RNA sequence: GUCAAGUAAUGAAGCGCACAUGGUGGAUGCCUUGGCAGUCAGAGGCGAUGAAAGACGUGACAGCCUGCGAUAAGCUUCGGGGAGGCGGCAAUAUCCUGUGAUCCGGAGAUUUCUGAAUGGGGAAACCCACUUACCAUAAGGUAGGUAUCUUGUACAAGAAGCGAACGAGGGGAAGUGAAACAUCUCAGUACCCUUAGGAAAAGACAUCAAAUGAGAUUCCCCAAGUAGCGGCGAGCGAACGGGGAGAAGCCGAUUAAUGCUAAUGUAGAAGAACAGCGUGGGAAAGCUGACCGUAGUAGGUGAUAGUCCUGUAUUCGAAACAUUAGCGUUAACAUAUUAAGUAGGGCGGGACACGAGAAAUCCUGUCUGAAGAUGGGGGGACCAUCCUCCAAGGCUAAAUACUCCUGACUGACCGAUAGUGAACCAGUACCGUGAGGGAAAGGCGAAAAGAACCCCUGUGAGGGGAGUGAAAUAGAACCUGAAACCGUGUGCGUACAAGCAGUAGGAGCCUCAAUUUAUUGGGGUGACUGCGUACCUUUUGUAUAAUGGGUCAGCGACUUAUAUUCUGUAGCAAGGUUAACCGUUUAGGGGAGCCGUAGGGAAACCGAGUCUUAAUAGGGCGUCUAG
RNA sequence: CCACUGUCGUUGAAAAGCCAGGGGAUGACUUGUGGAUAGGGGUGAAAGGCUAAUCAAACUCGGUGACAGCUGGUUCUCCC
RNA sequence: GGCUCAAACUAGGAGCCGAAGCUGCGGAUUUGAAACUUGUUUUCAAGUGGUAGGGGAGCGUUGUGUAAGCCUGUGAAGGUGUGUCGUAAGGCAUGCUGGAGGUAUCACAAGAGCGAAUGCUGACGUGAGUAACGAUAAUGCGAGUGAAAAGCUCGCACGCCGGAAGAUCAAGGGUUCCAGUCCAACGUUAAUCGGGGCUGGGUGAGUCGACCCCUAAGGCGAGGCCGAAAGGCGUAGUCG
RNA sequence: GAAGUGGCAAAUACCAUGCUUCCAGGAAAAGCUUCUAAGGCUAUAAACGAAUCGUACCCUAAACCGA
RNA sequence: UUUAUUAAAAACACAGCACUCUGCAAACACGAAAGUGGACGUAUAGGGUGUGAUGCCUGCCCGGUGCUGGAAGGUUAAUU
RNA sequence: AAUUCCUUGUCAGGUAAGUUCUGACCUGCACGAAUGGCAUAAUGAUGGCAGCGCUGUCUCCAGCAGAGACUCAGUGAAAUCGAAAUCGCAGUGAAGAUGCUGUGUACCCGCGGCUAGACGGAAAGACCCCGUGAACCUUUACUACAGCUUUACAUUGAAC
RNA sequence: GGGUUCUAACUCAGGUAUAACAAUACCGAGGACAAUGUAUGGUGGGUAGUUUGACUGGGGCGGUCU
């Protein structure tokens, strides 16, 4: 049957990407948290 | 311990023992129940009890012929061999020398001989008096102990 | 002062398992089963240490009964006769003589029979 | 000999037990490159001169990591150093190097793209430009300029973003406790948000005190779990004053450069002294005899080294740049002049230990509103007297808080299920749309000497020889190599017998040792007989058909800090004991304070008594010793 | 595009399917791409439906080691 | 089982069996008692079932001092046997394995003792060589290659789809594409084959698509409005 | 080294963004053609250009979403 | 139309009907406010509620609780 | 009667026989007029009842075809599991026994079936009670708050 | 001690200019109202936090509680 993921690159980069994170104060806190944990993947 | 904030599975239904955290002390990699923290091991020793114990130690050294009284133990040059020869003629190759005003070259002479130490009487401790096989006290240091105890 | 308990645990479990030698299956192999097998063996040995004293007297009495009935009276009358004759010989020695010395047991029975 | 009757022995498809010998597995032990907790110092930022984080590149050589940036494991220079070197896995090749390489330290040059990202846009590492000067003649190149906001005269200077904790400020829960719960607690905590500095804040009396007065702020030990607050519940919880640390008071105690002077830091240099003999694969261990020591408990080296190496004690170096302090100069800002919409008041809240309470004091949303040194604030309702101090201007070091970090040093901290989640290519793999969650995984050997060659096999795996090595059941999944679990061999038992599988007896067989030779003793097995329904938990009571456990191995639960009471023990003893601090630091000093030495009473007060009472009566509580 | 009946499947081929049938099939239709609404909130031709296999209050992290008069467990030995 | 002048019943009598009760013998231990007097000795008396629980005395383990000691390549720790000793926890000695450490004694401190917690992690059993091997569209044979062929290649025949199970894309993926080579693992069997390993190669545009110009929904939004802060909205515009 | 032109049938594609009807009344902006405001253009050609990125392959699937 | 995944129905919706609110900066809704939707609509419109094509129709009760109107009296806050 | 407890009410019809169905009665436990009343063509994978046709639904199952099951070769799970040398019966017993008593029966080990028991497996019973447990929902429970509304003061003035 | 009037605070989600939104100016319409702040009374399941006893031949119901 139809499953939950249903990928789309435009939608992925527009809802989770680097610019979408950087465009809000809370997304920048997401990025700061990821950098402090040391993740090799910042954003989708 | 890192993480361990979420409940690993639901309380009922899975057939597993109920778990609240993956850092439970029951779990491998979980926290210590009763994890140690830094602590202070210093004890209060009454002033009169410390003085009494030092008095007992000195009396027992005299009774066991471990205390050796000398007029003065001064070394002309900061040389290990000279103090080794002096302790050999004093028949105390390994010893704790107690003097008032430890000389700045008696210190250097004694600093290498293995079971040999030199102390001012104001820095003499009970363990130091008991550990060494002999205690070579000067008469001046013995008088200072007389007045201190 | 962390204490690792592997060495002491190993020698404790080895002690129990070495005491469980000869046991069938898990009772001589796995500690969880072997430890209660060893405890139960100890409990049986404690009870049977009493019951052995109980069982060997039953054996001696049966042998003496056979011997006395072989020449004359029953066990009960034989023991009464010994008691009247003031013979202090215990049932262990009596059964030994019944089994291994028929003439001596015959004479011993004749004494009890003369006493009644 | 034939018949009859009776009665042994013998077997094993498989199985049990014991032992021997393996497999698997990876415990344990020993080990460490990694962690954890601190002490003493330092430092507390990086960024438009483009950060932190990244993308893509970059090598003789494919990848990943490290470094670097189209000048790309790097270029120049100044110092150090002195024979090897071109980073790691990880070698090979071409080569470099006394014309001084590699390497270490200071400075500089270069420094793609993204990212505050800043020329506009955007799905980060991309798309699209405009313009100035120059060059080219084609369709371009080189060097720049072009974001926004703030402050200055369309021009110059700043800012922005990131990042540990600590500070200050603006907002501010609930779980919980009260054995329910709403006041209250939790707690002004978590969290959100703003914004500094090496600290911050506070700070010089419109403060306390009430003593013979003191003399800013901050922090520590007491005062004291006291006075109080409190559905007077649960709880909350001072101050005065005393002992300390540090002390400072001013009217710019500001910031930023520049130059001299001194010191420090960032590479380095020298650095003593052991031989023989036996064992051993190897000596540092053994025996004998030496030597150095201002250097003797360091790390290594084929086993345990003061004299083998690296070191250590000790003595020392700087061309350059940083930092700290002192003096001088420069430029930016500031430089009050005694304080009215202020003090006080009403209303509603908040803060004070203090919940409206008899509620002082402080803050202010709202509404008001002085006196103004012949004056005003405070001294816990309020008044009088007395004392003290002058708000409505600004500043001010130290003692105090902390650790993303740098150096040194330490540990009755861990040692691979521990210690960081991470000893290893870990914030990785993997899981999730995402925020986010989040592993496992160390060890040959002293040295690779990592097994030439031969043989079986498919030129495979795997093995056997050979060889190496002290050792190869140290052969790479490699130290040790446990248990569960699975085999192989040997001995005995087992196919007419009913059940927690043992126990107490007990025949036979097998096997070792003595013994003059089947007799004992040790070991394996166990026909047959008696008895005998696991363990844990929970219960009145469990073989229970009640719970829990497939097994093994490893880990897994009464701790810690403080207060208090009792007991033991030790020192002192009608006395005992200091705390913080100081200290060249377990000593010594520090007597503030605490407990004990007296009780009664609500208290004043009195005191071996005291309270109640008109009572000297009576009665209550005390007296009639050790802390 | 749906999902009415039954068989099968139920350690499935499948964390909702297959087969045989069934309903709508120019409409209040089905569907692609992008966008909006966010948790006591949304959205709902209304079933407390749905809001990423999670819904009478999502998920993640934090308060947090919530509390648990409840259940489980609680490890060496001997003597009174 | 079996039992009838009982092996039933009534009334007596005498023997015997029968418990961890009592006695005998040996040993330990608690308390109290006369003494060389701290277990210094000889005894004596009364005791010694035990859950919750109270009291007492010890064992072992890691670590620190004792210890620059003592032991240890003439073999440490650990592992595995055996013997031996103690009331026990446990101690000691020693064969084998092992290959580099250990620790007397007395104090001192604990991450100090595991069978259970539907405990945690790893390993490995039972079930069991059992179920299953994923559309019932289907295969047979001859050659080839190969260590080996039902499955690979070629051939002949057969079967299935054919509004697809053929072809072109988008989305999504990212090299799976092609060739050579290999078969350990992966592929639910084998494999010489492969979307697996390895090594090479391969994607060529003025016209196709994107980029680009334009805008929709909807974003962001000089100034502006609002809001404790954070921010929310919005004009010109700028994206989409 | 060959042929390669006639009949018939015929789409849901094209004419057709047409036509006819209906009500539920049917994007926007640019490119393009013209007009001017403040202040080069049109024909003829000739020569020379048109950058960058994607393009393999699956795509009713063994390559996507479902471990 | 609906309980994605045990209920498809008599449940929901529905055209139609009624009551009531709303004079426009509408009522009403989101929002802290600015700003929005309602609506670039305007009582033949918009909101809320009930009922539910159509045919025939829809009786009595205003005590209670709401809603609407009224204000003579009683009571009544801050305040003063 | 989607409403009627008593109740299978009564009477009529339909069947050989009808607690259901249809018609009627009215004694409506406890219908009733927009929480609409009574009907109603058409429509419905809607409910009840009755027929024709048709049949393996059944009497009563038989034969056949393919896929498993079964055997061989290759690969190779699962839940469960204290340990097992794991029989019946009548008793006993924490009260329903493979395991205890007595007794009966039974030589050792597979394979194909089977499901009567192992209070078989699965899920710390959802029923029920308990806990000074949770949640969400309701209201004329309590206490609050948002919102709406009243007045006073302020913004806020002048004249008659 | 109330009404009436006025305009000048205040309001306009009116018109005209200011490109637009907003503001500003003028005009127009309202007008000491409205609106907002503080205080205060009412209302207020719209929303929050909670409570809603025990004994009991199970519990509820009933009864009981000194």
Short mmCIF file of C-alpha atoms (C1' of nucleotides) in Angstrom, two decimals, chain B residues 1-6 22-23 25-30 32-34 38-41 44-51 78-81 84 108-109 111-114 122-123, chain D residues 37-38 292-296 313-314 413 417-421 427 437-441 555-561 570-572 576-579 585-591:
data_model
loop_
_atom_site.label_atom_id
_atom_site.label_comp_id
_atom_site.label_asym_id
_atom_site.label_seq_id
_atom_site.Cartn_x
_atom_site.Cartn_y
_atom_site.Cartn_z
CA UNK B 1 25.67 8.92 31.53
CA UNK B 2 25.05 10.08 27.96
CA UNK B 3 21.50 9.76 26.69
CA UNK B 4 19.04 7.53 28.51
CA UNK B 5 16.15 9.99 28.50
CA UNK B 6 13.47 8.10 26.61
CA UNK B 22 18.98 2.52 28.87
CA UNK B 23 21.34 4.00 31.47
CA UNK B 25 22.37 0.71 36.78
CA UNK B 26 21.06 -2.76 35.84
CA UNK B 27 22.10 -2.20 32.20
CA UNK B 28 25.53 -2.56 30.66
CA UNK B 29 26.76 0.95 30.00
CA UNK B 30 24.33 2.42 32.49
CA UNK B 32 26.63 3.46 38.70
CA UNK B 33 24.16 3.10 41.50
CA UNK B 34 26.03 4.94 44.24
CA UNK B 38 35.44 13.16 45.45
CA UNK B 39 35.64 13.03 49.23
CA UNK B 40 37.77 14.39 52.04
CA UNK B 41 39.72 11.81 54.03
CA UNK B 44 40.55 15.65 63.15
CA UNK B 45 43.29 14.64 65.57
CA UNK B 46 42.99 16.39 68.91
CA UNK B 47 45.97 18.63 69.63
CA UNK B 48 46.72 16.85 72.90
CA UNK B 49 46.29 13.49 71.18
CA UNK B 50 48.84 14.40 68.50
CA UNK B 51 51.29 15.64 71.13
CA UNK B 78 76.85 19.40 49.35
CA UNK B 79 78.26 15.94 48.66
CA UNK B 80 76.45 12.62 49.01
CA UNK B 81 79.61 10.61 49.76
CA UNK B 84 77.23 8.49 53.52
CA UNK B 108 71.61 18.15 49.04
CA UNK B 109 73.87 15.53 50.61
CA UNK B 111 68.67 13.99 48.82
CA UNK B 112 70.13 10.93 47.03
CA UNK B 113 70.84 8.33 49.73
CA UNK B 114 67.93 5.88 49.43
CA UNK B 122 58.85 21.52 62.78
CA UNK B 123 58.22 19.18 59.81
"C1'" A D 37 38.89 13.61 39.43
"C1'" G D 38 41.76 17.40 40.89
"C1'" C D 292 78.91 8.11 40.31
"C1'" G D 293 75.59 10.68 43.29
"C1'" U D 294 73.35 18.54 44.08
"C1'" A D 295 71.93 12.72 39.36
"C1'" G D 296 68.84 6.12 43.72
"C1'" A D 313 70.21 16.72 39.50
"C1'" U D 314 72.64 20.95 37.98
"C1'" C D 413 40.37 6.76 40.27
"C1'" U D 417 30.48 -5.18 29.63
"C1'" A D 418 35.17 -0.66 33.30
"C1'" G D 419 36.70 4.41 32.28
"C1'" U D 420 33.95 9.42 28.01
"C1'" G D 421 28.79 7.41 23.88
"C1'" G D 427 28.81 11.29 17.23
"C1'" G D 437 18.43 8.67 19.20
"C1'" G D 438 22.85 6.01 18.87
"C1'" A D 439 26.23 1.04 18.99
"C1'" A D 440 29.74 -2.89 18.36
"C1'" A D 441 34.79 -3.25 17.68
"C1'" C D 555 27.71 -6.81 35.15
"C1'" G D 556 23.55 -5.92 38.54
"C1'" A D 557 20.65 -3.46 44.50
"C1'" C D 558 21.47 -0.31 51.84
"C1'" U D 559 25.72 4.45 49.18
"C1'" U D 560 27.51 9.53 49.95
"C1'" A D 561 27.48 14.53 52.46
"C1'" A D 570 41.20 6.67 72.98
"C1'" G D 571 43.07 11.70 74.84
"C1'" C D 572 42.14 15.21 78.34
"C1'" G D 576 36.79 19.41 76.84
"C1'" U D 577 37.43 21.32 72.08
"C1'" U D 578 38.62 25.04 68.36
"C1'" A D 579 36.08 26.71 63.14
"C1'" U D 585 50.65 23.58 55.02
"C1'" U D 586 48.76 16.72 58.62
"C1'" A D 587 53.15 20.89 62.70
"C1'" G D 588 52.53 25.48 64.97
"C1'" G D 589 49.14 29.50 65.66
"C1'" G D 590 43.89 31.14 65.64
"C1'" G D 591 39.15 30.82 71.96
#
